[PDB]
Symmetry: C3
Subunit: 227 residues, 3 copies
């Protein structure tokens, strides 16, 4: 019986036997209700791609917790040079960790790491399919609509986190199409409202996806559900 | 009632209330019928990926026009350091500009930026779906055949620009398959003939795609259609 | 009547009128039964992506043979600076060489080139569809499961090499799904066992894919089949 908390933008914290955080953009995240000090003990950090609003505080959280960062090969190379413990994977690959299974899923996006004024290659972007005690969480990362999402329908995902903010990621209309492709038991919208460029009508998303038969739960930053 | 002009290779100029150019490879483009001075006022420049035969003269055109370059996050970072005004997006994302909507579409290709002798990471490659006054133009950028194109069928695209030159991009046979996937009202072949490596039998493309029920319009560089 | 030899990890050697090697990771490859000196004359080297366990000894093999390396634009740029003869292509593109046709196929993965301590951008990762005297070989490169593989079903591939090692690439279960998508006449598992991280139950793969109606041939490193 784990606690899954949305912390704003794309930050998702999973508290169970082990504690896992995805795309830990805490410092400088204007809708994040906690500071780094407010986080619990962290065991794993999952990073979907290199962009700073996802990579976030991964280095500091990992070092302060002796946590392992799970990401693609190229991002882990970058982090390794920062003195961070990593477990590299790549797109479509999966591994069984002490807490459960992680699979990196395809995304259509980019994965540059901005280090000073230099854009470093951070592999290709992903999402994560996480299986813990028979329960499945999908975090799509940053992505546009892609037919690769149809590969997830047979998984019978319990909770799918989908970006709806538009411009850099799917807007509301395409995220509805994604929800229909994936057919999760519940969908949670994310990556909206953080800046005005990614404003989204989240109430309209909930209304439209529920009309297609998929339950939607709107989590404000700091709110949680149990799996 | 806009004027859409093919200027050779992958260069497409849209003249309406605002003027938009896609992949503005003008200087050094051996099939381009105009020089930079021959271009009209430009409001927007769309860049599908980092390769020089698409990025082209984007920097000079933007600075001489105070134009905005629309491209992915990584390419816009590169251009920003060149003093260019940008509006960053990423794959599958869309935004409503003063002239109409632009959506970046998935492509399967690469996006290196050659800066001197260094290959800079330019994100992931895209195409563009452009909606202006209810009319839709698809420019596929450089790409191979991908099932992501099937996402465009429901758009009822008016004009689709598809590469047919082979080697770096789809050849004639795969571009026919793409046309069948997308089902646009009209298809225009591009990215062929510019160099001998990308020779294509464009008359055979027209013949084969029309046998599948899709009207093909062959535009020589400098020729145009109205939308 | 060509000889196709699996040399371990992802190394595939095709001996015919011309000799072709794919992802020539020889030196430092712990399951490779030959040393560089043990290779025959090489005419072409195909590199699916930038990762060192695939790029491998491409530079030394090419220079010692005056061989041409076929890969994406970005990888060929890197190799060109190493003094290597290249023929650049990109994803979905094809070209007819003196020995037959090569087409680069989509993969979902990454393509960083590790040069010293720097990660260089090596384009996007691919596989190869090779057509020689009417016979077709698919080498998927490193990849996760992707619907782009369904584009290959109509090719009636004779032999498909698929990664099954998990973590960085498809595991056994997803590779079975891939085999069903592609429907080749025979499948050969690869990219497993080389390190403990990519252990795979290869006998289980053979059993499961044959239950789906696809013949599987397990080649130990050094074993071959004729096409
Ligand atoms: Mn983001
Ligand atoms: Mn091009
Ligand atoms: Mn590999
Ligand atoms: Ni992003
Ligand atoms: Ni290109
Ligand atoms: Ni790899």
């Amino acid at each position: 019986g784990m606690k899954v908390t949305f912390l704003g933008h794309a930050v998702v914290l999973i508290e169970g036997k082990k504690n896992i955080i995805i795309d830990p953009f805490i410092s400088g995240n204007p809708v994040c209700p906690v500071k780094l000090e407010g986080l619990p003990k962290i065991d794993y950090i999952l990073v979907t791609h290199g962009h700073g609003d996802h990579l976030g505080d991964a280095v500091e959280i990992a070092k302060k917790n002796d946590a392992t960062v799970i990401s693609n090969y190229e991002i882990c190379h970058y982090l390794g040079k920062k003195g961070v413990k990593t477990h590299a994977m790549h797109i479509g690959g999966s591994y069984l960790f002490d807490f459960g299974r992680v699979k990196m899923t395809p995304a259509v996006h980019g994965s540059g790491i901005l280090d000073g004024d230099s854009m470093i290659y951070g592999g290709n972007p992903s999402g994560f399919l996480i299986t813990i005690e028979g329960k499945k969480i999908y975090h799509a990362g940053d992505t546009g609509l892609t037919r690769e999402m149809e590969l997830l329908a047979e998984e019978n995902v319990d909770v799918a986190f989908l970006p709806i903010g538009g411009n850099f990621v799917m807007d509301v209309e395409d995220a509805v199409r994604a929800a229909v492709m994936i057919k999760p038991k519940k969908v949670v919208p994310m990556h909206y409202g953080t800046w005005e460029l990614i404003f989204a009508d989240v109430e309209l998303f909930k209304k439209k996806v529920e009309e297609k038969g998929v339950e939607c739960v709107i989590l404000e930053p700091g709110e949680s559900l149990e799996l």
